[PDB]
Design a protein around this nucleic acid. Structure first.
Ligand SMILES: [Zn+2]
Lengths: 350, 377, 165, 108, 54
RNA sequence: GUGAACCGGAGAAGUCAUUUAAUAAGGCCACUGUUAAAAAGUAUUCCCCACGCAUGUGGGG
């Protein structure tokens, strides 16, 4: 089946779709992408300049029906923007305020002719020029060409075949999804209904910018009956590995014996029958260590090594007994253990 | 050309800077709580010291009429001096106080000779004192901190003409931050009655707050800006640079010092000449934590050396290199862990360090630039 | 956890001689005196070699010393913030309560090495108000995972819930 | 911080001087890495340097702002910078697992 | 061809952008408040710079 | 090429001064670690290799 509709995902950290009430200094977003807004994004996708687009490309593109579904309705944030005149000639500074929509997501569906939709979707996979969201200081956070086309039906049906993506586990959700749709003719309701508002977003020209009124209707959707909630992919919260060493799984129990044969049953520093193994590099533990990470030791020398690294703040690189810099401290601790230990206490505890 | 100074210091339990509530000043860095000394505290405590005495050519006050009155030895013109100052543009804020004016102590004689003159009017007097105030930007302390004087105009009758009263600063002092987490503590005090016979009893536990910290301090001096600020005096600029370094090395903010007495000294001073300013505060995004055997200062200096080596190997360009000297008291704290040395020199005396700094800057000598003496008073 | 429960049971299995051995060593490290090292090793090492999520050496040493000087019977539902909230809502709110609140709030800016003495102060306040129970296991887990934010949030939330009854 | 450069637009702006375009790209790469805003730097002096720069080439534009939808919480064996870089790495891993291939490999 | 540059930059306690009141500029993202340096502030620093003039 | 493009809210500032947590207390009364042993008058010493095979000699771990 030939494609009928086209899907656009508009979501970023900041975005702003200006309205006609922005006349002198205060620039305001309306609530949602407009027809003239998205049909400058499509025009910049196929590389059509401000001239040569009004006479040819705009009338065919304006012959479309589009609807916007709103999730994360956005929080309006204002910005104090100053333009420095000078740095006519004066040292004056012009002040203005600009409005942005923070943390918003919009799904736009444009329905029309099949091959025009195919050309538009082919253009969106590699846009000719830079693509932003309303103003050039607002890049998208998700790819615009993220959902495939299809031979769907009228805009309410086209705004139901997209899942509602989430981002983390306890992400709050709205039960209602308001949607804004273009009015539809048909000669039964040939006159505009009572609940229809008027928007000035029908583009004709861009360099001497020209906009025409367009009747706009509003509807609603409910999650669970029309749109199914999806789930996030990947991992968001990042934590260091930090694998605590285990002395009970089979892999470490075989690696330890392999190391105890690699050194011929001799403690490394004092050269006595080794009964234990001490790690050096800790960033392999949990059952993935290599025999080169481990060094064989006896009870006295490993107790001295444990004493020497109790509160030293060593995370991954621990004491290496083969290092000839740690020899003196290990020998002194061994002498202290020989002088002060009591075998009776250890024999009594076990 | 920029001269940057990075210092590591450790302080005894004290309170060198407090907010409106009396607690020591803190801040947030790296997601944890640090301890802070505000930069305006460091600048004031440096410029008002026994080491910066010869270069204190500026003054900051609202009572300029009192300065005019004390500059003479008669009944003076105190009321009409304040009337002239009101005509100037230093209007009373909500019909109270004045506006801060930074001006040289040299040019007050012109103010005395102009205001007292009777062969003129109030408008011309105001215009003349405005003109002489706008040309009082030649002092070692005003050449570093910079100035911005702008009247509220609410009293500008389109009769007093003003000029370029802003002086671009040459010295940028950062807020000092602790190299570890902040551990504030509360000292509890009771004021005791001297009379042995009280015949009464009631709890009167007071509340004082203090903290001890290892501070990292960062300074920056623009050499080419100092020449323009001082109109082209290389000797005065060199003397100011040397005296500022010597003062910053051996001074502390005079906070609650009669009860805590925390006159400590830095354990490391690194002076570097660069083309673009760089701060090493990112060495301490990970806080310094003490271990079984460690100085806090030694660990902090090791972290500083690690980050300095990383920056030098990472942001390296043969078009403009960086050469720096590292000073410790009798080489008590070497830069690092006796490995990966970076500093082109290892000084062990502060005077030799200042002499080497001046020698690189202009080939001057510290005993030679002391001849450039500013206003002392 | 299970290493923590076994560690607490082993600590309560001790007698007066070993408790005195641990009591003589308050304010000291682990690598200093041989009898304390031997006793703690013989109490802790089999549990560490069995259970992978046993408490770390520093945390276990701190709990061992605190149990030595401040012997409290193990009970569930008697966490430190709950008892501090129960005690704190009995004093005047002008002088004493801010002092005890500051003492309790000092703990958030300390790491696990420099925390034996403020915890000893808090447990001395608990002992002065005729307390004979404590949750050693929950305190051990909280100290084991301390630098995180949710653990401190739960600590302060439990304190508020006990304080505003 | 995120930046984008249009190569075709820059070449058309220079009308064919590709060496000049490459030099301007290199100059911007140096400048945007070693330049800070001048707001209140005479009292705070925050002359810090980037702790990691990633340059990518792709067809569609994107910004990795969705990586930090969970605010970074600091832990014992990490600092803020390393955790931010780790979250960026996780998001890049997820994107290259999901959005890749289609006869268009990405280059970092 | 579309070259993209991403940077992570940790800053010392400072105030690099301001509102009309004096606070640092902020924004909202992810359910919290985040400090923000505006787009036109960064473009003005890159332009008219000694690095971009040399 | 999108009420869009082109666009710094910027310059500036010591929270300083004053203060004992002081006067007092016994952790006291009671308790076997007891019952047992040849480092030596044996009847196979835990493994490999040279020889002709009358409870055989040499060599090495
Ligand atoms: Zn050994």
């Amino acid at each position: 089946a030939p494609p009928n509709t086209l899907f656009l995902r508009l979501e970023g950290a900041l975005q702003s779709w200006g309205s006609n009430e922005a006349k002198f200094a205060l620039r305001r977003t309306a609530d949602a992408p407009t027809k003239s807004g998205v049909l400058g994004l499509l025009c910049a996708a196929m590389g059509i300049g401000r001239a040569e687009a009004a006479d040819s490309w705009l009338p065919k593109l304006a012959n479309l029906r589009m609807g916007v579904r709103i999730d994360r309705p956005g929080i309006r944030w204002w910005d104090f923007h100053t333009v420095g005149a000078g740095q006519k000639t004066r040292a004056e500074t012009l002040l203005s305020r600009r409005e942005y929509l923070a943390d918003a997501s919009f799904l736009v569906a444009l329905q029309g002719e099949p091959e025009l939709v195919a050309k538009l979707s082919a253009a969106l996979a590699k846009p000719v020029w830079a693509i932003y969201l309303g103003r050039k200081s607002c890049p998208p956070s998700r790819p615009v060409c993220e959902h495939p086309p299809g031979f769907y039906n009228t805009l309410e049906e086209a705004l139901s075949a997209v899942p509602l993506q989430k981002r983390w586990h306890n992400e709050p959700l709205p039960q209602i999804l308001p949607c804004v749709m273009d009015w539809i003719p048909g000669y039964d309701g040939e006159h505009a209904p009572d609940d229809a508002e008027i928007h000035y977003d029908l583009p004709v020209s861009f360099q001497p910018p020209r906009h025409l009124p367009r009747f706009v209707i509003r509807r609603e959707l409910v999650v669970g009956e029309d749109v199914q909630v999806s789930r996030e992919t990947g991992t968001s919260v990042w934590r260091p590995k930090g694998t605590r060493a285990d002395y009970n799984n089979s892999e470490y129990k075989k690696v330890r014996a392999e190391r105890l044969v690699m050194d011929h049953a001799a403690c490394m520093v004092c050269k006595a029958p080794a009964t234990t193994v001490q790690h050096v590099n800790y960033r392999r533990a949990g059952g993935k260590e290599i025999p080169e990470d481990l060094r064989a030791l006896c009870r006295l020398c490993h107790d001295a090594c444990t004493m020497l690294e109790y509160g030293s703040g060593m995370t991954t690189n621990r004491i290496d007994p083969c290092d000839p810099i740690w020899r003196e401290r290990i020998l002194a601790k061994r002498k202290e253990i020989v002088e002060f230990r009591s075998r009776g206490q250890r024999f009594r505890k076990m | 050309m920029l001269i940057e100074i990075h210092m590591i210091q450790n302080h005894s339990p004290a309170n060198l800077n407090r907010d409106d509530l009396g607690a020591p000043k803190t801040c947030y860095f790296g997601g944890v709580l640090r301890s802070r000394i505000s930069s305006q505290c460091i600048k004031r405590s440096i410029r008002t010291s026994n080491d910066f005495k010869a270069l204190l050519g500026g003054v900051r006050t609202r009572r300029l009429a009192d300065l005019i009155q004390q500059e003479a030895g008669e009944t003076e013109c105190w009321k009409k001096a304040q009337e002239i100052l009101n005509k100037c543009g230093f209007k009373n804020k909500d019909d109270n106080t004045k506006m801060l004016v930074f001006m040289s102590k040299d040019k007050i004689k012109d103010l005395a000779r102009i205001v007292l003159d009777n062969s003129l009017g109030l408008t011309e007097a105001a215009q003349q004192v405005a003109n002489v105030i706008a040309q009082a930007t030649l002092a070692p302390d005003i050449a570093l901190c910079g100035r911005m004087l702008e009247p509220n105009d609410k009293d500008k009758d389109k009769k007093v003409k003003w000029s370029n009263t802003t002086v671009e600063a040459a010295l940028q002092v950062a807020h000092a931050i602790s190299t570890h987490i902040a551990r504030p503590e509360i000292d509890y005090f009771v004021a005791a009655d001297d009379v042995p016979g009280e015949d009464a009893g009631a709890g009167h536990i007071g509340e004082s707050m203090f903290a001890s910290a290892c501070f990292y301090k960062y300074f920056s001096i623009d050499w080419e800006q100092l020449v323009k600020n001082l109109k082209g005096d290389t000797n005065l600029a060199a003397h100011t640079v040397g005296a500022f370094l010597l003062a910053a090395a051996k001074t502390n903010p005079s906070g609650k010092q009669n009860s805590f007495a925390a006159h400590n000294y830095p354990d490391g001073i690194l002076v570097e000449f660069k083309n673009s300013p760089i701060s090493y505060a990112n060495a301490f995004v990970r806080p310094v934590s003490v271990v079984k055997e460690s100085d806090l200062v030694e660990q902090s200096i090791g972290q500083l050396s690690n980050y300095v080596n990383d920056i030098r190997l990472g942001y390296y360009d043969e078009q403009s290199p960086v050469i720096g000297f590292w000073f410790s008291p009798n080489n008590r704290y070497p830069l690092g862990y006796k490995h990966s040395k970076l500093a082109s020199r290892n000084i062990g005396n502060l005077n030799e360090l200042v002499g080497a700094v001046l020698d690189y800057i202009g080939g001057f000598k510290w005993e030679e630039v002391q001849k450039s003496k500013a206003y002392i008073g | 956890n299970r290493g923590t429960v076994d560690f607490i049971a082993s600590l309560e299995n001790l007698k007066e001689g070993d408790l005195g051995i641990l009591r003589k060593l308050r304010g000291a490290r682990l690598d200093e005196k041989l009898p304390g090292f031997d006793l703690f090793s013989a109490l802790w090492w089999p549990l560490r070699q069995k259970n992978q999520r046993a408490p770390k050496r520093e945390v276990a040493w701190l709990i061992a010393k605190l149990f030595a000087e401040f012997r409290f019977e193990q009970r569930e539902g008697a966490t430190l913030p709950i008892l501090m909230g129960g005690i704190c809502r009995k004093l005047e709110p002008k002088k004493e309560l801010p002092r005890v609140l500051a003492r309790f709030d000092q703990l958030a800016s300390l790491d696990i090495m420099q925390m034996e003495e403020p915890l000893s102060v808090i447990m001395g306040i608990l002992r002065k108000h005729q307390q004979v129970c404590l949750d050693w296991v929950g305190l051990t887990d909280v100290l084991s995972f301390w630098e995180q934010e949710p653990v401190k949030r739960e600590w302060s939330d439990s304190f508020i819930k006990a304080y505003k009854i």
